[PDB]
């Protein structure tokens, strides 16, 4: 048969490659609009930053010849598909300025997504870019070659912050302007995003939240951006404020657009027309924790979908049930990562939930280069199914979020979580993995064992520092009694007042809280996270 | 309530601690036969190897002795007190402390006596220089014999303890030999195809290894070990790492039930025959969850999980420990080796009909710096399509993929649901499709029959189709070289007569070669799953 696919990225070409494997004499035409094809855009930041030496490192082991000689896939570069005709099973295209028509039996719509442009003045001014194409990344390189030293990023998304770091590695002053309460809003709660935020500031990236941008001042077509009513010079601006899926070829063909604005498909990835599969960044998908439909615009999602499309055109049955939003990005020295549902979207899903956060050693506390990762876990009440997890930190958080991610897709309970046999040795984890121990911490709050509160809760009431050595401390109703000294002292403690137990990262806070309870104290609050989030 | 606990292993003191947090009034007494309470054994190798400066560190928080457990948890820890007999009718425990004999009254009793090292019945096994890494005493015995100038060593056992000892001892710039009776290093964890990698990294790091050899005698004056083939290996230190025995003897002497393994039997609640007697840690029988088999999982993580549930039910709860999956990990030099779930040998002895697949893949996006290629092996059950075991070895982050796959195995995931698993991907952390997702797809490619793959084990007429660019490789004998990007065209070269075995660097471009020829109708085309990596 002949298959025509509209794309050129992860989705398009993986779909193409799998159909080639299943059928060796199907006719596969991939229609692409740009010069480059199969480019590893999921790296462009690390190219700007210098980790990657040249852009062709993100297409390697890859021109049209590669796809011809290897897979016998005919890829037409710099050709636009301008209309789909489902009645004649045709795709009209433009090439060399002379139009033509491709006839298909199966068709892949894999058109990706474009950067959403905030409707504001000066957006098209020179020096305002997006990190969507090789070309735009390079332009950032030429303006730094030409004397650019100040940068504004709009948006603390993972693309935003990675272009923040990429740009600071160019020795530019970076300021990031975020619309929301905290940095990385899709992935994190305030509670946690504080950390990331302060790490950025500590690396010379300035970060301002809960502000829009009003205008982009341009001189001779340059820049400076008006925050709240402030100005932030800028020789470049990268706009990273979300995406908008390239679905209009699909809508103008009668294909069904779901409430995200993106092409609706089913589990099989077929679109409304049976002959017409679509997948990747242009397509809607289901959040399997809540079942709401969303756009999960990631590269792993794209390969997974594009393969299921490939398999189906070839006659098989394969499903892509949905996603859970497990994302991860890398900041200077911190990792941040998210799985399942966070507090805002757990709220908008109507789920009754409870929250617990417990940081833990990376590897054996005594082994060299052990770090403290900070995990927050969101558990659904009654069922006790775990519905979200998030992590930020200095050392190895990615593994904990991968395990908690597959735990959440398993619908595991904090009960069956706590006894998950994990791979432990002193260089890899402590005896009970951070994921284990926060399972236990969830059940100590659930079982009402301890009553627990976060750090935003500032009401300054007595705070007890069950610590022991102050090099970093808080100023003050601060009474200090070492945990080891507590069984004995305990006299200072007053009672009849709210005492909020506070240790270094909350372990000893727990072990005190229960000590006080035995004592007879009525109000004891343990500070989740501990001095881990005090800053 | 007063609760007694035999031994301050991990299990013993986590059990006691969990009780303490839920009951401030209970009397908790812990009896310990040795001087040191709560030492972290899992770190003694890295102590000997020098990563950890002081033995005492393995007992720190940022020294956690009886005064610690008294001042902080109001737990009465009795050091150097041996528990000699338990009597369930009397509900008492006889202790000998100070060469005097007393008794301990109890309402609930916890047995957490751990395991002693199994000692192979050999002549000279009690000579000087022969050690186990079971206690801080034996560990610093090693360090002092090196201080006195020992340079030759022999390890018996390619288990994790033995292997960690090989690296620790070689870090002292000694010449280290490992002798293991079975055909492969790390038998309980790995298969031969995988186990050879670990082996070869050991020899390329200068710890020499002899497999499929027994130890027959130890000579002395002060050591030297004669090995099978009567090969004699000089020795100035030997560590025996041959396995363990659960310290369950007071239990059967008290009439409690001993399981088929020799360890104390426990139910899911971690109780024994006597309900007043809970038992956990290295002395207890456990369930392997994929096969239902009864086993001994003498690991520190299972010890603490049990210890917590034990403490939870003494203190009026409902704790459950269903078993384990035998997910273990060790580090040898620049390599990491890990297993979860069932292994080939244990799968056939469990009688399950399964298939296997091997597919190495990059640590991170190939263009990102410090990408390594981990090797994953996946054992998937027939009919169900459940993933029942995985092994991974390599330089790079393998541990992540075995933690995720171990989770999938305990959740009963099939390769079909494994392929869709939403993981955390960004160029510095994984490639677009994580190695786990890729092996899932390669498995569904075996099950779907799209490729016939065979392992690193070939003397039959056949042409080895080599797709690669630079040959720096198999050398020869029926090898035809055609790089993959020219293969589409150059075909009347590959004789459409003989069985073809496509071999590439990692196994990936081979799959696209094998399918290319499938289109060409070659029929008798098979593939080397694993790639060039599994080769000598
Ligand atoms: C800077 C950056 C960093 C990223 N980092 C990550 C990350 O860390 N992790 C992650 O998971 N994801 C990341 N992504 C996202 C990832 O790139 C996308 O999810 C993935 O590229 C999806 O590709 P796709 O095939 O859906 O669309 P694309 O890869 O965008 O492919 C679009 C192609 O379609 C072609 N096209 C579109 N419409 C037409 C038409 N009408 N006619 C002809 N051709 C057309 C265009 O030529 C374009 O070549 C990142 C993206 C960017 C930009
Ligand atoms: C060198 C080494 C490295 C290891 N590495 C790892 C690893 O990397 N990963 C991993 O998962 N596991 C590892 N382990 C295993 C881990 O130590 C065990 O799983 C764990 O120690 C078992 O806990 P336990 O308390 O049951 O045993 P133990 O901690 O040994 O507790 C036994 C205690 O009971 C006391 N006792 C015993 N009998 C009596 C008696 N009759 N009277 C009084 N007291 C008694 C003994 O004094 C001892 O103090 C390692 C073990 C060793 C030795
Ligand atoms: C690679 C790309 C062109 C598709 O090419 P592909 O041939 O389909 O993908 P691979 O190179 O890994 O080979 C894929 C197949 O070989 C298989 N394979 C077989 N043995 C294997 C082995 N030992 N190891 C790895 N893969 C193996 C894989 O399972 C996969 O199987 P499948 O055909 O059933 O799907 C596409 O992913 C792309 O466009 N990448 C650039 C866009 C992108 O992802 N950007 C993100 C930037 S980080
Ligand atoms: C340390 C030991 C005695 C257990 O004592 P413990 O006080 O109960 O263990 P911890 O120090 O971790 O404190 C654990 C408690 O703090 C809880 N906790 C509460 N909030 C926490 C937080 N924010 N972070 C960490 N722990 C927290 C833990 O869940 C746990 O409570 P719980 O199990 O009752 O539900 C035992 O593990 C041991 O002997 N370790 C050495 C033996 C060993 O592990 N050897 C292997 C060498 S690596
Ligand atoms: Ca994802
Ligand atoms: Ca384990």
Author numbering:
A (entry chain C): 1 to 61, 67 to 232, 234 to 466, 473 to 488, 493 to 551
B (entry chain D): 1 to 62, 66 to 224, 227 to 463, 470 to 483, 488 to 551
The authors write:
The 3.1 Å X-ray structure of AfNpsr reveals access to the tightly bound catalytic CoA, and the active site Cys 42 is restricted by a flexible loop (residues 60-66) that is not seen in the bacterial homologs from Shewanella loihica PV-4 and Bacillus anthracis. As expected, the enzyme is a dimer, with the N-terminal FAD-binding domain (residues 1-448) having nearly identical topology to related Npsr and CoADR proteins. Residues 449 through 550 make up the C-terminal rhodanese domain, which is linked to the FAD domain by a single amino acid chain. On all four AfNpsr subunits found in the asymmetric unit, two loops on the rhodanese domain comprising residues 465-472 and 483-488 were missing due to disorder. In AfNpsr, CoA is deeply buried, and in this configuration of the protein, CoA has little access to the solvent except for a small opening above the pantothenic acid arm. In AfNpsr, the seemingly low accessibility of CoA from the surface of the protein results from a larger loop consisting of residues 60-66 (TTYGAVR) that closes over the CoA binding pocket. It should be noted that for the dimer with the ordered loop, the average B-factor for the loop is 67 Å2 compared to 47 Å2 for the rest of the FAD-binding domain, suggesting there is some flexibility for the opening and closing of the loop over the enzyme-bound CoA. For NADP+, the phosphorylated 2′ hydroxyl group of ribose introduces steric clashes with E183, M184, and M185 as well as strong electrostatic repulsions with E183. A metal ion binding site is located 5.2 Å from FAD. Given that AfNpsr has all of the same catalytic components as the other Npsr and CoADR homologs and that none of these have any demonstrated metal dependence, it is likely that the bound metal ion in AfNpsr plays a structural role.
NADH-dependent persulfide reductase (Npsr) has been proposed to facilitate dissimilatory sulfur respiration by reducing persulfide or sulfane sulfur-containing substrates to H2S. Pyridine nucleotide disulfide oxidoreductases (PNDORs) are a large class of homodimeric NADH- and FAD-dependent enzymes that generally function to reduce small molecule substrates at a catalytic cysteine positioned at the si face of the isoalloxazine ring. The major structural difference between CoADR and Npsr is the addition of a ~100-amino acid rhodanese-like domain to the C-terminus of the Npsr. A surface-accessible cysteine in this domain serves as the initial sulfur-accepting site before a molecule of CoA bound to the FAD-containing domain chaperones the sulfur to the active site cysteine adjacent to FAD.
